């Protein structure tokens, strides 16, 4: 049986502040801009519709020296940082982005259509932009949290799912890594593999994967390292109702309608346009301090391995500024050829923390337990090379003067004495 | 005279955790996709607008063997599981659905008509989609809940209701089965029998009955096994205003308007489109622990016949993702013929429960009482073949370690000691 | 190590009221109207989208003589005024502004395009208005607060960013000055330098810098002078969805879409129209009394150098009234020629304060600490020439009879005794 | 120095109820309908957009005779009524108006312009109607309250503001009189003198003054008789965005835009159409009892000169019913000629009160005080002939049987004993 870190981890009156400097990110909000020839990234893809998985590296309390550590034996005892308070600073003004696609697959507007026009042509795709669902999360664990998304599954011992057929979907687990896409209104799937025409979702999501955090799994993990704090805030509505183009795969059962003279049965592949509606200072989940006093799972903000993952999505600040640059300010009349528009979005974060020094006495039982949990714990006391995270090193940003910082100042106060 | 189960069921300090594994369901949102020849279902009809009637099977405490059961005589006593808490965990992103009908019956948009064009021709139907009323409901009871819808009644000893005439309506009661439709803004009725043209409601309902919980009935049942807890959160508004095509049954009394020259009097058969407006985290009725400490009726969450019904409707997460497949990825110019769009909707559920062991002493009085109430309960201590339920067996999912689980861990806490 | 003024500034029972007469301001909301030949401002640009940085000049309490100052030695001690409560009276009726541009750079409406028309021509700009993002703020500090915005950045030791190219951005800090524009929903940036065509945002901002208070920097400053108090309320949504005109600088990766025959790929330079939705006396942040009992930073509203800054933005009273004057009223038929339309906007402030007398004992340690904090504080007890602020002098507006003023009256109540 | 009435006004245990009979008003909502020839008003102007200034007369307590006035000396003392509870009953259903102008000055809709048509003709005005900003107020002063609007100022010593120019504005204080217009989302101004074309506002305001309570002045008045209790509930948003017609006085500085070939530069005089949004029972500020237990200013609901002023504006019930009257019911075909549409609105108020009988001993000190306050107070104990109030006489409406009236029932109950 799995048991609470309070059963094997002693706390200590020692607290330290730690804050990341200002973290900025700027680039194009749709696709990346790589060199004209090389395939090396020039200007990243920084959208407001992107996860932020921060891997927060903490100094090893065992290297560090401590004064209140005089009734502590480094022979048989060890040290972890237990996270006590988190503040995820956000800067930039609130506002909304808006993604589109030069050739969106949209047939007609089936909200209040004018009439019925004969069978269409080939390529009825049109340029259309829209504003996605608004989300605001913040998961804190000492393992990176996972995501779920719908992806293409492998068929059974039967027929061959030849081209054009509908491939069986499969609900896949995945690790959330910096720069992944959140669901925008089209659900959480994998667009590249479930949509061949690559045309019916704006460019920012069309060739990628909108992931949704596996809350139900993460929450149900025995040890519960993947997250021991969260906050969700999603909300959306139907701006528009449309028809898709191209031949319907599963045709309509004729005993559901009466045969209407004249017609090859209009499209039924309907799809709506979301809308995040409105972003308001008061809706905001960020910029406030969170005290994870008691954790949701067994692990009680114990940052094994001296690490921390702060995951964050946030579409309230999503605005894309456009920059226009002229070919030559030598003209005196407006001509479009003379200017080039670019699109730029820039993200701004600030992470603060306050951790508590804790001690673990390595006895027969505890060692066993830690062992079945995670061996590295023990092993490192004497891996994710495949995942990409926004790296945050606070090995040199630790303080003990809580007073010098807003979050510390709060903490002192809020913790009372 | 009906009596509270506190009068004849003894409670004990024994609480077990029960949980279902991830339930998933993936199907077309509007209609089922059966094999091309066969009439066996290949892909189901999973939609956001459906009920979820879980039949929760529980292990029979009488077979199970227990330690605190020492001051318990199995000769004279029996055992029932009392439900103490429920938690309906809901996977996937909140999103919204959109339903439509290729040949919908929509004469013209009477919100702000342009003019008055003379008597139209035949078949002026059209492709029109729209977002249904938003609803979120959950009923827990140890018997299946009943619903009410408007159906076709049988006429009195008088004239023959020949074709064309309006049949009289009748309020019917019916049990809620997994898969039925909730009222979508069109009322709760039976569209197959009450609408011949099968063309004035999107297909997902036009050939179906839209039930609505009979809360008035179920509330009033003398035993109250039907439901001992429930929460409803329904809301909608008028998206558009239309006119129906087809001659009007009941003509307009001429003393209601002045004879306007030029006309056969335009249609006055009006219908509105609903819109459930917005879904949001805070609206959410699920993912939180319920504790049915005291039950609404007499039965205080005693699951007779080791059984439980969790009826659940949820239009918050009703997004249908479309998957486009290509006939041949050999072409390099977009052509609709080369693509097949498909609609799919995946549901994800999690059921969690906490049960109390309760003993009953089969005496002279109790037995006669339980007999009149339900005989089965007695006979079974020494049916629904016609109703279809999502089947959930937790016989092997019971645990006495409440600690290992969020709903249990909560339990323990909240209960106090 | 910085230390709370509570550590070196004694408080006395001495409270004065002070406040500014009616503060009006009236001009054109879009641009300043200077003489026809001279470059001398005739009518200012008073807009509801502007910053209000008030410099409050306070009487120096060392020249003043006091009666309760008999256990005070002016030889070794000095005096500062400590802010206790502010109150920012707003006049005019709630209302909302509207900003356009005769030659807005607005290709087409991509929200639900009709079709696809071939490649346009040159100059497709058109007149367009709109209601900006809605904001309410108010920073109280003893130094002028700072702003953050996106500017043009100097490139590195490499290639020459020739015309055409997209300049690297750089986030700049800057002093908020009366008259600056807040972000309007086009982000916080320098439109003069970052947008050449000077045609893709209303005139009230296309040639200015919209700034956004760097809460994050100020909050974090070690002494906390820049603000010891603040309230934001900003809210906004996407009224429209547009396409820009002109060539695209970062061209769409061809591997993200399928070569649709017939096109030079439509604009992908999308931009949205904000809207600040709706203003409600409920929303009001203003017209109340603020009591800075405990400061956010180290400075507990020590108005060092007998100064105060109240920075304020307010879009909820943002109306521009329009005045129509005739060329001759001798006509009896309407002709546009004969009427001249003007736009005019007027702001009305009222500034209320309540100060507590404080005494500092100039010792060894105290002096050196004040010195490395700010030397001027010591020097002056025996600079912003480049900054423009709405001067507010209250030297002659101090009152000891707090009962005569609402704020006065409240303060006594609220403080209790 | 001013001082609280508590300082010279003694209270007694004497309360008295009062109430005006049902107050009605019916007429035209836009303009007064005088006799055809005469200039006498036949149907007055009753709009939901108007201020309701009541002058509540009151019995002089000194001529009244009292039984508990046995330890009171009519030779040296005197009597005033102190208001204690005000109940502003409102009848009719909630509902909303819509003002219009057949030749409103509306060039084109610049929210989302079609194209760019060249230089328009002359008189492009059109019929437009609209709902105004929603406001709900109620001020209770023993003097009439003041209001503020943007008037036409006199120029200084220099040039002559010839016809065409824009007049310099000037903030004016005016007394609020029954029948005035509340701002309607075009701000507080004087449409007659500031808008020569008298065509760019619906008629109900186009030739009048819309005023806004000078809350800032009133509140700040040393005595505060103007008002001792108030509640405001104003809201509104932008239903559309338009463009005005007629030459632009203050032309756009050319360096704010690039020279667009093909243009005299479209209009840039923009104006928005407000929208009060929604009226709801809960929003309601009326139909509840108000207990001015403590006043805001110095005057504590003391009705000097036996007088009272209830200023109310309410747009929540602003429905205008239309009545159609035929020229001859002898026709059998609908013909517009045969009918006359008319417009009417009617207003239903009910004023209830509760006054407390206070005595004032006329001493040397108190006399000189009262005199400096208001000589009439003293001279009347042994003027607004130019202002127009809804006169309300309660001289005969006083009862001391508080029990007989809801208000009074409430008072007993609320005040406890």
GROMACS .gro file of C-alpha atoms in nm, chain D residues 28-263:
model
  236
 1279UNK     CA    1  -4.616   6.124  -2.589
 1280UNK     CA    2  -4.266   5.995  -2.538
 1281UNK     CA    3  -4.077   6.214  -2.785
 1282UNK     CA    4  -4.254   6.546  -2.797
 1283UNK     CA    5  -4.547   6.749  -2.637
 1284UNK     CA    6  -4.866   6.748  -2.839
 1285UNK     CA    7  -5.012   7.103  -2.818
 1286UNK     CA    8  -5.361   7.226  -2.956
 1287UNK     CA    9  -5.346   7.263  -3.349
 1288UNK     CA   10  -5.350   7.639  -3.324
 1289UNK     CA   11  -5.312   7.728  -2.955
 1290UNK     CA   12  -4.968   7.686  -2.787
 1291UNK     CA   13  -5.130   7.522  -2.475
 1292UNK     CA   14  -5.012   7.163  -2.407
 1293UNK     CA   15  -5.289   6.913  -2.486
 1294UNK     CA   16  -5.091   6.589  -2.422
 1295UNK     CA   17  -4.779   6.643  -2.223
 1296UNK     CA   18  -4.435   6.471  -2.273
 1297UNK     CA   19  -4.406   6.159  -2.058
 1298UNK     CA   20  -4.085   5.959  -2.121
 1299UNK     CA   21  -3.901   5.693  -1.946
 1300UNK     CA   22  -3.589   5.901  -2.014
 1301UNK     CA   23  -3.691   6.188  -1.783
 1302UNK     CA   24  -3.607   6.294  -1.433
 1303UNK     CA   25  -3.876   6.278  -1.176
 1304UNK     CA   26  -3.825   6.565  -0.934
 1305UNK     CA   27  -4.096   6.561  -0.674
 1306UNK     CA   28  -4.145   6.836  -0.423
 1307UNK     CA   29  -4.294   6.679  -0.140
 1308UNK     CA   30  -4.482   6.936   0.079
 1309UNK     CA   31  -4.507   6.874   0.439
 1310UNK     CA   32  -4.731   6.971   0.723
 1311UNK     CA   33  -4.568   7.236   0.947
 1312UNK     CA   34  -4.535   7.059   1.277
 1313UNK     CA   35  -4.578   7.378   1.446
 1314UNK     CA   36  -4.926   7.437   1.350
 1315UNK     CA   37  -5.009   7.069   1.416
 1316UNK     CA   38  -5.070   7.006   1.794
 1317UNK     CA   39  -4.899   6.715   1.978
 1318UNK     CA   40  -4.960   6.516   2.304
 1319UNK     CA   41  -4.601   6.401   2.373
 1320UNK     CA   42  -4.502   6.776   2.325
 1321UNK     CA   43  -4.574   6.849   2.704
 1322UNK     CA   44  -4.190   6.884   2.805
 1323UNK     CA   45  -4.142   7.109   2.496
 1324UNK     CA   46  -4.168   7.493   2.499
 1325UNK     CA   47  -4.331   7.645   2.195
 1326UNK     CA   48  -4.195   7.983   2.305
 1327UNK     CA   49  -3.834   7.894   2.271
 1328UNK     CA   50  -3.839   7.559   2.086
 1329UNK     CA   51  -3.941   7.459   1.740
 1330UNK     CA   52  -4.020   7.158   1.517
 1331UNK     CA   53  -3.883   6.998   1.198
 1332UNK     CA   54  -3.963   6.665   1.034
 1333UNK     CA   55  -3.666   6.430   1.001
 1334UNK     CA   56  -3.711   6.185   0.724
 1335UNK     CA   57  -3.635   5.822   0.832
 1336UNK     CA   58  -3.759   5.577   0.561
 1337UNK     CA   59  -3.841   5.642   0.187
 1338UNK     CA   60  -4.022   5.386  -0.032
 1339UNK     CA   61  -4.036   5.468  -0.406
 1340UNK     CA   62  -4.313   5.243  -0.532
 1341UNK     CA   63  -4.310   5.192  -0.907
 1342UNK     CA   64  -4.596   5.056  -1.114
 1343UNK     CA   65  -4.633   4.911  -1.471
 1344UNK     CA   66  -4.446   4.625  -1.628
 1345UNK     CA   67  -4.052   4.640  -1.683
 1346UNK     CA   68  -4.009   4.696  -2.061
 1347UNK     CA   69  -3.785   4.923  -2.274
 1348UNK     CA   70  -3.817   5.218  -2.508
 1349UNK     CA   71  -3.683   5.309  -2.846
 1350UNK     CA   72  -3.624   5.673  -2.966
 1351UNK     CA   73  -3.567   5.760  -3.327
 1352UNK     CA   74  -3.532   6.061  -3.574
 1353UNK     CA   75  -3.683   6.038  -3.933
 1354UNK     CA   76  -3.385   6.231  -4.071
 1355UNK     CA   77  -3.107   6.126  -3.848
 1356UNK     CA   78  -2.768   6.216  -3.968
 1357UNK     CA   79  -2.623   5.881  -4.055
 1358UNK     CA   80  -2.372   5.865  -4.333
 1359UNK     CA   81  -2.278   5.492  -4.341
 1360UNK     CA   82  -2.206   5.190  -4.100
 1361UNK     CA   83  -1.839   5.179  -4.040
 1362UNK     CA   84  -1.840   4.872  -3.832
 1363UNK     CA   85  -1.775   4.652  -4.128
 1364UNK     CA   86  -1.814   4.874  -4.442
 1365UNK     CA   87  -1.891   4.712  -4.777
 1366UNK     CA   88  -1.650   4.914  -4.996
 1367UNK     CA   89  -1.565   5.284  -5.053
 1368UNK     CA   90  -1.829   5.471  -5.259
 1369UNK     CA   91  -1.702   5.815  -5.380
 1370UNK     CA   92  -1.813   6.165  -5.246
 1371UNK     CA   93  -2.188   6.143  -5.147
 1372UNK     CA   94  -2.459   6.394  -5.241
 1373UNK     CA   95  -2.651   6.621  -5.014
 1374UNK     CA   96  -2.887   6.512  -4.733
 1375UNK     CA   97  -2.809   6.143  -4.689
 1376UNK     CA   98  -2.993   6.134  -4.358
 1377UNK     CA   99  -3.221   5.839  -4.281
 1378UNK     CA  100  -3.490   5.724  -4.034
 1379UNK     CA  101  -3.313   5.531  -3.741
 1380UNK     CA  102  -3.449   5.436  -3.401
 1381UNK     CA  103  -3.271   5.277  -3.099
 1382UNK     CA  104  -3.283   5.190  -2.728
 1383UNK     CA  105  -3.104   5.429  -2.486
 1384UNK     CA  106  -2.851   5.369  -2.203
 1385UNK     CA  107  -3.020   5.211  -1.909
 1386UNK     CA  108  -3.023   5.429  -1.592
 1387UNK     CA  109  -3.184   5.391  -1.249
 1388UNK     CA  110  -3.139   5.673  -0.991
 1389UNK     CA  111  -3.292   5.812  -0.678
 1390UNK     CA  112  -3.151   6.108  -0.474
 1391UNK     CA  113  -3.329   6.229  -0.157
 1392UNK     CA  114  -3.234   6.594  -0.061
 1393UNK     CA  115  -3.424   6.856   0.142
 1394UNK     CA  116  -3.321   7.089  -0.154
 1395UNK     CA  117  -3.340   7.016  -0.517
 1396UNK     CA  118  -3.037   6.836  -0.646
 1397UNK     CA  119  -2.802   6.967  -0.914
 1398UNK     CA  120  -2.706   6.851  -1.245
 1399UNK     CA  121  -2.420   6.904  -1.502
 1400UNK     CA  122  -2.408   6.936  -1.876
 1401UNK     CA  123  -2.180   7.048  -2.151
 1402UNK     CA  124  -2.285   7.392  -2.266
 1403UNK     CA  125  -2.181   7.658  -2.518
 1404UNK     CA  126  -1.910   7.885  -2.361
 1405UNK     CA  127  -1.821   8.249  -2.439
 1406UNK     CA  128  -1.481   8.298  -2.610
 1407UNK     CA  129  -1.201   8.509  -2.442
 1408UNK     CA  130  -1.058   8.840  -2.555
 1409UNK     CA  131  -0.924   8.777  -2.916
 1410UNK     CA  132  -1.089   8.651  -3.235
 1411UNK     CA  133  -1.460   8.630  -3.332
 1412UNK     CA  134  -1.578   8.255  -3.346
 1413UNK     CA  135  -1.743   8.308  -3.684
 1414UNK     CA  136  -2.008   8.074  -3.804
 1415UNK     CA  137  -1.870   7.734  -3.881
 1416UNK     CA  138  -1.625   7.706  -3.596
 1417UNK     CA  139  -1.665   7.482  -3.304
 1418UNK     CA  140  -1.773   7.669  -2.991
 1419UNK     CA  141  -1.567   7.625  -2.682
 1420UNK     CA  142  -1.746   7.405  -2.440
 1421UNK     CA  143  -1.821   7.483  -2.088
 1422UNK     CA  144  -1.936   7.258  -1.790
 1423UNK     CA  145  -2.268   7.414  -1.645
 1424UNK     CA  146  -2.445   7.362  -1.336
 1425UNK     CA  147  -2.833   7.363  -1.356
 1426UNK     CA  148  -3.107   7.264  -1.126
 1427UNK     CA  149  -3.261   6.930  -1.203
 1428UNK     CA  150  -3.636   6.993  -1.268
 1429UNK     CA  151  -3.919   6.731  -1.344
 1430UNK     CA  152  -3.921   6.669  -1.707
 1431UNK     CA  153  -3.549   6.693  -1.798
 1432UNK     CA  154  -3.356   6.446  -1.994
 1433UNK     CA  155  -3.105   6.195  -1.855
 1434UNK     CA  156  -2.797   6.130  -2.060
 1435UNK     CA  157  -2.890   5.867  -2.320
 1436UNK     CA  158  -2.552   5.755  -2.435
 1437UNK     CA  159  -2.475   6.072  -2.627
 1438UNK     CA  160  -2.354   6.237  -2.317
 1439UNK     CA  161  -2.465   6.521  -2.092
 1440UNK     CA  162  -2.499   6.815  -2.320
 1441UNK     CA  163  -2.744   7.077  -2.474
 1442UNK     CA  164  -2.834   6.951  -2.819
 1443UNK     CA  165  -3.005   7.276  -2.925
 1444UNK     CA  166  -2.706   7.508  -2.901
 1445UNK     CA  167  -2.424   7.260  -2.967
 1446UNK     CA  168  -2.589   7.069  -3.269
 1447UNK     CA  169  -2.705   7.317  -3.536
 1448UNK     CA  170  -2.846   7.047  -3.782
 1449UNK     CA  171  -3.076   6.930  -3.503
 1450UNK     CA  172  -3.062   6.593  -3.695
 1451UNK     CA  173  -2.824   6.377  -3.521
 1452UNK     CA  174  -3.014   6.250  -3.215
 1453UNK     CA  175  -3.351   6.112  -3.173
 1454UNK     CA  176  -3.626   6.398  -3.125
 1455UNK     CA  177  -3.680   6.333  -2.751
 1456UNK     CA  178  -3.334   6.486  -2.700
 1457UNK     CA  179  -3.241   6.657  -3.010
 1458UNK     CA  180  -3.380   6.996  -2.899
 1459UNK     CA  181  -3.319   6.959  -2.527
 1460UNK     CA  182  -3.063   6.926  -2.250
 1461UNK     CA  183  -2.962   6.589  -2.120
 1462UNK     CA  184  -2.819   6.645  -1.761
 1463UNK     CA  185  -2.622   6.419  -1.520
 1464UNK     CA  186  -2.644   6.466  -1.146
 1465UNK     CA  187  -2.329   6.662  -1.031
 1466UNK     CA  188  -2.271   6.394  -0.780
 1467UNK     CA  189  -1.913   6.532  -0.718
 1468UNK     CA  190  -2.040   6.881  -0.624
 1469UNK     CA  191  -2.343   6.768  -0.429
 1470UNK     CA  192  -2.161   6.533  -0.219
 1471UNK     CA  193  -1.894   6.796  -0.139
 1472UNK     CA  194  -2.138   7.070  -0.019
 1473UNK     CA  195  -2.053   7.174   0.329
 1474UNK     CA  196  -2.416   7.146   0.458
 1475UNK     CA  197  -2.527   6.874   0.231
 1476UNK     CA  198  -2.896   6.942   0.204
 1477UNK     CA  199  -2.882   6.882  -0.173
 1478UNK     CA  200  -2.870   6.518  -0.109
 1479UNK     CA  201  -2.848   6.278   0.176
 1480UNK     CA  202  -2.898   5.947   0.019
 1481UNK     CA  203  -2.870   5.822  -0.343
 1482UNK     CA  204  -2.836   5.511  -0.557
 1483UNK     CA  205  -2.738   5.505  -0.923
 1484UNK     CA  206  -2.751   5.204  -1.161
 1485UNK     CA  207  -2.642   5.303  -1.503
 1486UNK     CA  208  -2.530   5.054  -1.789
 1487UNK     CA  209  -2.500   5.057  -2.172
 1488UNK     CA  210  -2.292   4.929  -2.462
 1489UNK     CA  211  -2.237   4.998  -2.829
 1490UNK     CA  212  -2.519   4.847  -3.046
 1491UNK     CA  213  -2.363   4.990  -3.372
 1492UNK     CA  214  -2.082   5.226  -3.503
 1493UNK     CA  215  -2.161   5.497  -3.752
 1494UNK     CA  216  -2.035   5.776  -3.954
 1495UNK     CA  217  -2.169   6.127  -3.969
 1496UNK     CA  218  -2.240   6.342  -4.286
 1497UNK     CA  219  -2.129   6.701  -4.345
 1498UNK     CA  220  -1.783   6.854  -4.378
 1499UNK     CA  221  -1.528   6.773  -4.103
 1500UNK     CA  222  -1.429   7.084  -3.921
 1501UNK     CA  223  -1.097   6.982  -3.774
 1502UNK     CA  224  -0.951   6.789  -4.077
 1503UNK     CA  225  -0.706   6.502  -4.021
 1504UNK     CA  226  -0.338   6.594  -3.988
 1505UNK     CA  227  -0.184   6.452  -4.312
 1506UNK     CA  228   0.110   6.302  -4.143
 1507UNK     CA  229  -0.134   6.054  -3.967
 1508UNK     CA  230  -0.204   5.859  -4.276
 1509UNK     CA  231  -0.052   5.787  -4.627
 1510UNK     CA  232  -0.196   5.972  -4.929
 1511UNK     CA  233  -0.444   5.747  -5.073
 1512UNK     CA  234  -0.489   5.825  -5.430
 1513UNK     CA  235  -0.864   5.855  -5.516
 1514UNK     CA  236  -1.030   6.036  -5.222
   0.00000   0.00000   0.00000
